[PDB]
Design a protein around this ligand. Structure first.
Ligand SMILES: OC[C@H]1O[C@H](O[C@@H]2[C@@H](O)[C@H](O)[C@@H](O)[C@H](O)[C@@H]2O)[C@H](O)[C@@H](O)[C@H]1O
Ligand SMILES: [Ca+2]
Ligand SMILES: [Cl-]
Ligand SMILES: [Cl-]
Ligand SMILES: [Cl-]
Ligand SMILES: [Cl-]
Ligand SMILES: [Cl-]
Ligand SMILES: [Cl-]
Ligand SMILES: [Cl-]
Length: 670
């Protein structure tokens, strides 16, 4: 019906900062060092005062040692604070039960995972193994169905309680496997680690995975952020409904933001909170990572999370009151670039590849995900019709969408699928539906949609909903100008097509509950890592499991009503996950891209590059760090390895020479 092509080449972006590519094992290693050191005030005011055990005792036998060769500026010195500004608000501290801490790096900093992938932007190979993190090493069996995972041994939580396999097993069994619990990020279902995957304890520092497929090495990426980040079981397990009289809601809400010094495996601990103002994190004295000189990390003693807006993060970073920003809203690009143009600017700004994409996602579940009424179900059936999706995508003037956010070389024509900024992208495999409004109007008439009341808007046939006008709800995040602008644009464009679209503008936490719960027709969404990197959370590319897809989930317990193209997509993703051949993998992502964009798994809105804004006083910030690839730049820059020269240090500490207090007390100890 439509004359498809490939998307036109965008204006050549000279992608600012260049990456110094290194091999995978240049960053870190696990080993015992002859001696260890820490800030002098800890030894003098805490150890010598009998307030804290000596350093060698608080550390594991073989801590994670950062190698100096990879450090952009070398070994650091202690002091200073990294100041962050966020548009999110904390729900509480129960990350594994799906509670958000406010985003913008806070949960990234608090929740350490089995593996780590965000610093992999600097490693050149599409067959790279994720970095060891809480899992120090792992071995595959000869058949490739068994994965033996060795954990960091002798490490402790920020409260001094031992970290071991029991924390890993409580997360797997009582957060992932438990159907009533949904960990933060919305992708921690058991099938995300493969359908039929089991995990068992061997001993206190050894776990064993059993997979149906042979060598599905891609699941090591799923073991990174956000899907495998264990919580303190000694604190969380007594609150869990299986071991208490608590409901699942009571367990999820057992640790509100006012609960202080929540145990973490991260570099800093939350010590202070003031509603709609600030969150203060203080150095974790039990942190299990050190530099080559034996200095216990982090170098920075404090971290601030100012509770403001996402736009204000860009404002404060160029002004110098904030130290970091991911410039990701095109409406803020010109104002930020003008301010960064000054040689006296306190921060540096660098654009990366086009890895920020937006998609229109349609709910594909006709089996009752989100318990829809007669109207909702009729929309599910329209969404599932290929001709309907072809009309919606063809009715979008993508050049006008791009220009509505920012004029210039930033935006690129984005039909949907894999981001043009990743190596796995193939332009020739991307199906582009050019702007054809008349063809789109004709396509809808061809499936029995016509204006029966004379208002120009199309009606359902007499048999469906009494022949009333078609009305579609559109779920949006109200925290961003970009999301709102795209939602408003979609309403106006669909009105030209004869479709009435109604905005459902919700805050981040309400938006997540409506999305993951299936209570939506359509939704405007910024892409996650699977479309910007392919290799990070590959299971989210298709409905490989009942809850792995963002737009096609099944309610527990009903089976997935997959359309043939979705099953073809699920087979390609499964093949790629278990593929050991680089040429085969590249080819599978070409097939995937073709199936996705021809059948319109989602509908692309726009794609553009983001910019990393970092305060100039910070040392060890890697050159060319993207804002978003394997994860957000807050993770990619390795914040525990950042330092400031003594003569350049700011005096921003709110709890100087203080350490975190006890969980549920009492603020910092002093
Ligand atoms: O976590 C680090 C990021 O936090 C923010 O994104 C959040 C926010 O959009 C939530 O509402 C979503 O639920 C979540 O998925 C998403 O990552 C920043 O915009 C981004 O630049 C980066 O700092
Ligand atoms: Ca009508
Ligand atoms: Cl080295
Ligand atoms: Cl909120
Ligand atoms: Cl708010
Ligand atoms: Cl319950
Ligand atoms: Cl607090
Ligand atoms: Cl708040
Ligand atoms: Cl970037």
């Amino acid at each position: 019906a439509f004359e498809t092509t490939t998307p036109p080449e965008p204006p050549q972006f000279p992608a600012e900062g260049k990456i110094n590519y290194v091999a995978r094992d240049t960053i870190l290693e696990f080993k015992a060092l002859p001696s260890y050191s820490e800030p002098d005030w800890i030894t003098e005011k805490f150890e010598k005062a009998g307030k804290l055990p000596p350093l060698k005792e608080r550390l594991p036998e073989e801590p994670l040692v950062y190698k100096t060769g990879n450090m952009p500026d070398g070994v650091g010195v202690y002091g200073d604070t990294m100041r962050h500004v966020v548009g999110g608000r904390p729900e509480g501290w129960n990350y594994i039960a799906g509670q958000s801490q406010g985003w913008g790096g806070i949960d990234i900093a608090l929740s350490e995972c089995l593996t780590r992938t965000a610093p992999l932007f600097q490693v050149d190979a599409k067959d790279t193994e994720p970095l060891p993190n809480l899992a120090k090493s792992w071995e595959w069996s000869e058949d490739g169905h068994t994965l033996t995972m060795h954990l960091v041994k002798g490490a402790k939580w920020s409260d001094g309680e031992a970290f071991n396999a029991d924390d890993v097993m409580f997360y797997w069994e009582d957060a992932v496997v438990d159907p009533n619990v949904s960990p933060l990020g919305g992708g921690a279902s058991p099938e995300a680690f493969g359908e039929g995957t089991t995990l068992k304890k061997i001993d206190d520092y050894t776990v064993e995975w059993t997979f149906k497929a042979a060598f599905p090495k891609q699941y090591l990426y799923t073991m990174a952020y956000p899907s495998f980040c264990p919580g303190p079981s000694h604190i969380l397990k007594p609150q869990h409904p299986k071991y208490s009289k608590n409901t699942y809601n009571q367990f999820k809400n057992a640790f509100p933001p006012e609960y202080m010094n929540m145990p973490v495996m991260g570099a800093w601990v939350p010590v202070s909170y003031r509603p709609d103002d600030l969150i203060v994190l203080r150095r974790n004295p039990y942190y299990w990572k050190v530099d080559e000189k034996g200095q216990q990390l982090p170098y920075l003693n404090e971290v601030h999370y100012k509770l403001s807006t996402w736009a204000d993060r860009d404002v404060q970073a160029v002004a110098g009151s904030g130290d970091f920003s991911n410039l990701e809203q095109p409406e803020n690009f010109v104002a930020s670039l003008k301010r960064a143009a000054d040689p006296n600017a306190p921060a540096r700004l660098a654009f990366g590849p086009r890895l920020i994409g937006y998609n229109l996602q349609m709910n594909f579940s006709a089996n009752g995900w989100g318990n829809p009424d007669e109207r909702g179900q009729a929309i599910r059936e329209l969404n599932r019709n290929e001709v309907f999706r072809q009309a919606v995508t063809s009715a979008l003037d993508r050049k006008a969408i791009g220009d509505s956010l920012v004029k210039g070389p930033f935006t690129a024509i984005y039909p949907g699928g894999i981001s043009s900024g990743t190596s796995f992208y193939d332009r020739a495999s991307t199906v582009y539906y050019p702007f054809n409004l008349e063809g789109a109007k004709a396509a809808l008439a061809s499936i029995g949609l016509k204006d029966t009341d004379g208002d120009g808007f199309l009606n359902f046939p007499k048999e469906t909903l009494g022949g009333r006008n078609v009305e579609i709800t559109l779920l949006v995040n109200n925290g961003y100008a970009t999301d709102k602008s795209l939602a408003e644009g979609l309403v106006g464009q669909m009105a030209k097509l004869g479709l009435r679209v109604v905005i459902h503008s919700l805050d981040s936490n309400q938006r997540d509950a409506a999305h993951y719960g299936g209570q939506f027709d359509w939704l405007v969404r910024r892409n996650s890592t699977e479309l910007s990197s392919v290799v990070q959370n590959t299971e989210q590319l298709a409905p490989v499991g009942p809850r792995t897809s963002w737009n096609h989930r099944s309610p527990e317990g009903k089976e997935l009503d997959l359309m043939p193209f979705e099953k073809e997509m699920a087979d390609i993703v499964r093949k790629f996950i278990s593929s050991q051949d680089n040429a085969e993998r590249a080819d599978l992502m070409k097939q995937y891209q073709k199936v996705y964009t021809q059948n319109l798994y989602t509908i692309g809105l726009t794609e553009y590059p983001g910019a990393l804004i970092v305060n100039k006083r910070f040392s060890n910030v890697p050159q060319g760090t993207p804002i978003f690839m394997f994860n957000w730049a807050e993770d990619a820059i390795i914040r525990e390895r950042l330092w400031v020269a003594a003569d350049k240090q700011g005096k921003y500490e709110l709890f100087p020479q203080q350490l975190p207090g006890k969980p549920g007390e009492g603020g910092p100890i002093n």
